[PDB]
Design a protein around this ligand. Structure first.
Ligand SMILES: CCCCCCCCCCCCCCCCCC(=O)OC[C@H](COP(=O)([O-])OCC[N+](C)(C)C)OC(=O)CCCCCCCCCCCCCCCCC
Ligand SMILES: CCCCCCCCCCCCCCCCCC(=O)OC[C@H](COP(=O)(O)OCCN)OC(=O)CCCCCCCCCCCCCCCCC
Ligand SMILES: CCCCCCCCCCCCCCCCCC(=O)OC[C@H](COP(=O)(O)OCCN)OC(=O)CCCCCCCCCCCCCCCCC
Ligand SMILES: CCCCCCCCCCCCCCCCCC(=O)OC[C@H](COP(=O)(O)OCCN)OC(=O)CCCCCCCCCCCCCCCCC
Ligand SMILES: CCCCCCCCCCCCCCCCCC(=O)OC[C@H](COP(=O)(O)OCCN)OC(=O)CCCCCCCCCCCCCCCCC
Ligand SMILES: CCCCCCCCCCCCO[C@@H]1O[C@H](CO)[C@@H](O[C@H]2O[C@H](CO)[C@@H](O)[C@H](O)[C@H]2O)[C@H](O)[C@H]1O
Ligand SMILES: CCCCCCCCCCCCO[C@@H]1O[C@H](CO)[C@@H](O[C@H]2O[C@H](CO)[C@@H](O)[C@H](O)[C@H]2O)[C@H](O)[C@H]1O
Ligand SMILES: CCCCCCCCCCCCO[C@@H]1O[C@H](CO)[C@@H](O[C@H]2O[C@H](CO)[C@@H](O)[C@H](O)[C@H]2O)[C@H](O)[C@H]1O
Ligand SMILES: N=C(N)NC(=N)NCCc1ccc(I)c(Cl)c1
Ligand code: SF4
Lengths: 70, 174, 83, 69, 156, 104, 311
């Protein structure tokens, strides 16, 4: 089963044509892109404070070798 | 003295001209013209021509001379030859400076000189006007009159610029 | 009327930037001739006194020329105060 | 957090604030506590030069009033 | 004396500036480059240390060799090293760059980038974690903190 | 005099920063480690030349704020629009003649 | 007393440029879900100092240039002209009160392209020369719209004096009658300053060092700030109270700061134009509209009876 990613006819009525002209002239989609980067500015960042904080690991982690004893 | 500022600027004006007129590498010749243009604007500024002075900077230096340098970098010189390396350029450059220095020295010593024609050396300020108290720039009034008085000038000037566009597209299509 | 309307819709869909340019340029050429305020720009420009108003020698037959600036003869700027 | 960007902005803002503030106060200091006279046109320059002679100390910003009448 | 004291403080100042503004040129040769990207990514944000994400080779202070250096690539890497203005440091990251790694016995692989350029820090792993690389960069900072260029200059 | 001093200060400081940026202590004691047609499109020439001609037109429009103070507004407005329209015709000519294209 | 005034303009300009590097990095960081500099000094406040010192004690690797004089000339011209652009700015009082201040800024800014051209000649490499010429073509192209847009605005102001823009906007910001021009003016300044999405000098060379690199960078960022200060004056005029000039300076600084931050905001948000595409944005989009709006703004004051005074 499949779907089309980019197979659509734009509406050619006056309302739709005027919608695309306003987008062209008023940069609406670009302003909407500015909105998303603005919301990220006000999100808490994901940075951790290395070396005072460390990334999480699991017991299976493969690091430096060692020889063990009984 | 600052009473001789116009004369001093005109001395540098000539030195810039002897610079590019001796024709070194077109890159350095362009620099000499740029310096002369700026010095020439200062001369016009000190006679009360603020707009005309700034047009030299805006149009002559920021416009024409930019396109000259642009074209030089493309179709003439990409790397300058050492300045004054050629003997002919050095001889011409030295000769013009020697002539200029003699004019300056003699006009300053006698406050007048006869180099072909006779000039006064008292300073350019002596000829200035002594009665200005209008609430506007007279140079600005004159230039603004292009649109009221100069209808004919606008028509032929605008036409020539349009033809310049058409012409240069014909020349360069090849 | 319709074939032109079908023409405008095509350029509005394809070249809205050029349609706006030509529309604005047309209004810049047309509206000055239609505006009722255009006549005032001429009057205001003439009402601005850049140089001294040199007085006239009084020969005894100039009843329309004021003798004093505060006399009632001569051009009035009452129209401008309201504007 | 985002407000930790503010200290850098504040330093930038103070830096841009000084030029305008300095010029304004320097003008008052050098012009008797008033705005520096503007003379874009010959008429304004003529009146400023006349003020310099009228001042009696060769300072165009030193004003004389009815006390000189 | 004060003359020695002034030298000691100036060395601290220049060392502090140089380790506080380490601009790397990353040679992203292979998989080790991916972990280098995760160090610039938000969780570790190397930029917060003063380590800008991607500098040009002529504005760089540290070269990070992040992947396998083949024979075909070796001349190009040395050319970029020679164009770096000094002081310049090299961080070798991952087994491949360290000593050849999985491909040590290959006919086409340089057995360690330290055959081509001097190396300041070796980061072990295949690949080293982003955190391990960050540990290595911080170790390079401490190495720069120990430099005594001016002290040795005035004892010459 | 003030403008001269400002200009002299600005470029003198720029000069000082540039020279010191070139001559700073280095602490090393060892030896340190043409006029042809540049392969550049004629299209880039035409941009510069097109800029020049438009710039000359702009020089003629610059007096417009002062020209609007005239009592001969009828003439002034007609001539302003004429000049700008001719500028637009220039652009239309370059455009329709493929002078603004970057292909080929 | 006037030399004091010059220094109190130059030094804060250079300090503001230094800390704009910090602000740009931190604003970009938080829009990228990270922090940016926060180790070198508290909240990264010493990062600009460390960067400045580092760059100046860096080896000044200049390849044997084809012109020693033009190698030195380019950074001096760039930085010298950048500082000159600030001396007529009314904040609210200019250092130099020019009758034709607007025209002076246009004329000086048109000279800044020589630093690009000269640095191309001095590089002694046809590849860098070709990169210089592409940058020059972009810069002069967008000078056309900036000049025409500026002229259109001044038809509502009445003069070339920069402080008269303050008077013109006493009741209302000029962005309201002229938001179409403000839109194209703003984008033109981005392209003029080679800022993303018009940062094609950086992108194309991807696809100078030490102090001399630092000087070109300082001049670039001084121009960025000055352009946004100009935009605020041109379109977001602050009211001036002659008895409290510092209220003008506070409000006008905030607007300029915000406009400068919007430069960083835009850089974080969009991909880069192709070279031919930013050429078409100018010659086939901005210029037709700017010409039409120039015709409109000549007619409008005449037809409304709203011609401003000359003085
Ligand atoms: C213009 C001159 C400005 C000089 C700025 C001096 C910078 C001060 C400084 O070093 O920061 C504190 C720093 C802080 O120390 P630090 O760099 O080791 O930081 C340790 C904390 N972590 C782990 C997060 C990095 O002081 C020093 O490093 C000591 C050297 C001082 C260098 C200046 C001496 C003069
Ligand atoms: C009553 C009489 C009145 C008469 C006058 C009426 C006039 C009003 C109606 C006209 C409106 C004019 C709009 C002016 C803005 C310019 C419009 C424009 O040029 O947009 C088109 C341009 C290219 O469009 P494109 O999609 O590429 O397709 C066209 C080519 N086929 O697309 C672009 O330019 C996109 C911009 C690219 C840059 C992106 C980065 C900027 C995005 C953030 C900008 C934020 C807004 C700026 C605000 C500044 C404030 C100071
Ligand atoms: C190869 C290297 C190339 C480097 C080039 C870099 C260019 C650097 C900048 C050059 C300086 C050019 C000077 C242009 C100033 C024009 C500004 C202006 O018009 O006003 C300044 C002043 C008149 O002031 P204004 O208010 O307009 O009128 C008088 C009162 N109404 O007028 C004056 O103060 C008179 C000053 C006259 C001296 C000017 C000399 C310029 C020479 C520069 C070279
Ligand atoms: C679509 C996204 C586009 C993003 C582009 C970037 C846009 C940044 C906009 C920056 C300008 C924001 C304005 C900041 C206000 C500063 C604080 C202030 O003092 O506001 C006062 C103002 C009213 O006072 P005033 O400005 O003096 O207006 C009087 C007319 N002269 O306040 C009243 O209104
Ligand atoms: C607000 C809107 C309200 C709507 C109602 C208003 C009604 C009144 C206005 C009606 C005006 C309609 C005129 C529109 C003309 C459009 C012409 C056209 O569509 O040509 C497009 C084409 C250029 O496009 P291009 O992509 O390069 O090539 C096509 C291949 N795809 O072909 C071309 O070569 C373009 C033509 C040459 C360039 C012309 C340049 C115009 C002049 C520039 C200045 C602008 C106008 C004066 C100022
Ligand atoms: C309302 C008046 C306002 C004053 C306007 C100011 C003057 C502006 C003059 C611009 C004249 C441009 O004229 C322009 O020429 C070309 C002719 O190839 C036409 O365009 C034509 O060629 C293009 C290819 O370039 C074809 O794709 C298009 O289908 C066809 O229409 C435009 O439709 C027309 O607009
Ligand atoms: C390629 C060529 C392009 C050429 C473009 C030329 C376009 C010219 C369009 C505008 C011309 C007329 O523009 C305007 O018209 C009105 C007519 O109502 C004139 O008349 C108006 O102003 C005058 C003042 O002189 C008043 O006395 C008059 O009462 C008033 O109606 C205006 O003075 C003129 O400014
Ligand atoms: C902004 C004001 C800051 C004031 C700080 C004053 C500090 C003065 C001390 C400067 C110390 C510079 O330190 C020195 O810089 C130069 C940069 O070319 C480096 O480079 C130099 O040495 C290396 C060899 O060691 C040479 O190959 C290289 O060609 C040479 O340039 C040196 O490796 C470094 O030791
Ligand atoms: N683009 C950024 N904001 N980051 C960045 N690479 N900045 C460059 C760093 C820099 C350059 C010159 C000076 I003077 C100073 Cl103080 C700092
Ligand atoms: S060391 Fe490991 S992770 Fe790094 S390039 Fe070699 S194989 Fe890939």
């Amino acid at each position: 089963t499949y779907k089309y990613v980019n197979l659509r006819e734009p509406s050619m009525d006056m309302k739709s044509v005027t919608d695309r002209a306003a987008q062209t002239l008023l940069w609406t989609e670009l302003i909407r892109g500015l909105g998303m980067t603005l919301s990220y500015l006000f999100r808490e960042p994901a940075t951790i404070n290395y070396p005072f904080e460390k990334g999480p690991l699991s017991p299976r982690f493969r690091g430096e070798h060692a020889l063990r004893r009984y | 003295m600052m009473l001789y500022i116009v004369f001093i600027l005109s001395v540098i004006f000539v030195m810039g001209f002897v610079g590019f007129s001796s024709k070194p590498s077109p890159i350095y010749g362009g620099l000499g013209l740029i310096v002369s243009g700026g010095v020439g604007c200062g001369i016009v500024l000190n006679f009360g021509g603020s707009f005309l002075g700034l047009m030299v900077f805006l149009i002559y230096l920021g416009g024409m001379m930019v396109v000259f340098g642009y074209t030089t970098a493309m179709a003439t010189e990409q790397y300058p030859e050492i300045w004054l390396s050629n003997k002919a350029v050095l001889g011409a450059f030295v000769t013009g400076l020697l002539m200029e220095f003699f004019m300056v020295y003699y006009v300053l010593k006698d406050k007048e000189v006869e180099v072909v024609f006779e000039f006064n050396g008292l300073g350019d300020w002596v000829i200035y006007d002594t009665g200005d108290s209008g609430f506007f720039s007279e140079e600005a009034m004159g230039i603004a009159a292009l649109y009221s008085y100069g209808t004919w000038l606008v028509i032929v000037t605008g036409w020539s610029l349009l033809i310049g566009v058409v012409v240069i597209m014909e020349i360069t299509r090849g | 009327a319709e074939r032109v309307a079908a023409f405008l819709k095509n350029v509005w869909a394809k070249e809205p930037v050029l349609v706006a340019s030509f529309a604005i340029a047309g209004l810049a050429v047309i509206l000055p001739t239609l505006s009722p305020y255009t006549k005032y720009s001429l009057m205001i420009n003439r009402a601005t006194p850049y140089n001294y108003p040199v007085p006239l020698r009084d020969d005894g037959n100039m009843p329309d020329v004021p003798s004093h600036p505060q006399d009632p003869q001569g051009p009035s700027l009452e129209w401008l105060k309201r504007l | 957090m985002w407000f930790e960007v503010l200290p850098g902005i504040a330093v930038m803002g103070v830096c841009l604030f000084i030029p305008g503030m300095a010029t304004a106060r320097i003008h008052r200091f050098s012009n008797g506590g008033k705005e520096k006279r503007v003379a874009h046109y010959p008429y304004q320059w003529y009146l400023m030069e006349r003020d310099r002679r009228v001042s009696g100390v060769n300072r165009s910003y030193v004003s004389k009033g009815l006390e000189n009448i | 004396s004060r003359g020695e004291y002034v030298v000691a403080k100036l060395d601290d100042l220049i060392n502090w500036a140089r380790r506080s503004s380490l601009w790397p040129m990353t040679f992203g040769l292979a998989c080790c480059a991916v972990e280098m990207m995760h160090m610039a990514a938000p969780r570790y944000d190397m930029d917060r240390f003063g380590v800008v994400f991607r500098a040009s080779p002529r504005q760089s202070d540290v070269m990070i060799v992040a992947g396998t250096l083949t024979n075909k690539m070796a001349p190009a890497l040395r050319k970029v090293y020679d164009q770096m203005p000094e002081p310049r440091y090299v961080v070798s990251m991952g087994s491949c760059a360290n000593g050849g790694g999985y491909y040590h016995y290959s006919y086409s692989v340089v057995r360690g980038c330290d055959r081509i350029v001097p190396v300041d820090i070796y980061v072990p792993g295949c690949p080293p974690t982003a955190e391990a690389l960050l540990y290595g960069i911080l170790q390079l900072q401490k190495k720069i903190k120990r430099e005594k260029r001016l002290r040795i200059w005035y004892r010459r | 005099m003030n403008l001269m001093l400002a200009l002299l200060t600005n470029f003198t400081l720029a000069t000082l920063l540039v020279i010191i940026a070139f001559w700073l202590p280095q602490l090393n004691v060892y030896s340190e480690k043409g006029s042809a047609r540049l392969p550049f499109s004629m299209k880039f020439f035409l941009v510069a030349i097109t800029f020049l001609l438009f710039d000359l037109e702009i020089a003629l429009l610059l007096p417009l704020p002062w020209a609007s103070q005239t009592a001969n507004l009828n003439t002034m407005l007609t001539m302003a629009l004429f000049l700008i329209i001719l500028l637009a015709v220039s652009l239309a000519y370059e455009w329709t003649q493929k002078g603004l294209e970057w292909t080929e | 007393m006037f030399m004091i005034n010059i220094l109190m303009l130059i030094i804060p300009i250079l300090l503001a440029v230094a800390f704009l590097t910090l602000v740009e990095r931190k604003v970009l960081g938080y829009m990228q879900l990270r922090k940016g500099p926060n180790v070198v000094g508290p909240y990264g406040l010493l990062q600009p100092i460390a960067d400045a010192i580092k760059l100046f004690i860096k080896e000044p690797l200049r390849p044997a240039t084809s012109s020693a004089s033009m190698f030195i000339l380019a950074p001096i011209m760039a930085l010298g002209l950048a500082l000159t652009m600030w001396i007529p700015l009314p904040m609210p009082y200019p250092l130099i009160n020019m009758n034709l201040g607007v025209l002076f800024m246009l004329a000086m800014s048109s000279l800044a392209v020589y630093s690009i051209l000269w640095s191309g000649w001095a590089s002694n490499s046809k590849y860098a020369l070709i990169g210089a010429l592409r940058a020059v073509a972009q810069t002069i192209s967008y000078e056309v719209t900036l000049a025409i847009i500026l002229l259109s605005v001044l038809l509502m102001s009445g003069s070339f004096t920069l402080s008269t823009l303050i008077t013109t906007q006493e009741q209302m910001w000029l962005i309201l009658p002229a938001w179409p021009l403000a839109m194209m003016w703003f984008i033109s300044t981005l392209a003029e300053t080679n800022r993303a999405p018009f940062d094609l000098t950086e992108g194309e060379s991807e696809l100078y060092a030490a102090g001399p690199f630092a000087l070109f960078f300082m001049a670039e960022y001084a121009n960025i700030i000055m352009m946004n200060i100009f935009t605020a004056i041109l379109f977001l005029g602050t009211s001036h109270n002659p008895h409290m000039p510092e209220l003008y300076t506070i409000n006008f600084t905030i607007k300029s700061l915000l406009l400068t931050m919007s430069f960083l905001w835009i850089r974080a948000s969009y991909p880069r134009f192709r070279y031919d595409q930013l050429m078409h944005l100018l010659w086939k989009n901005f210029l037709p509209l700017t010409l039409a709006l120039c015709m409109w703004h000549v007619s409008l004051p005449i037809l409304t009876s709203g011609i401003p005074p000359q003085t």
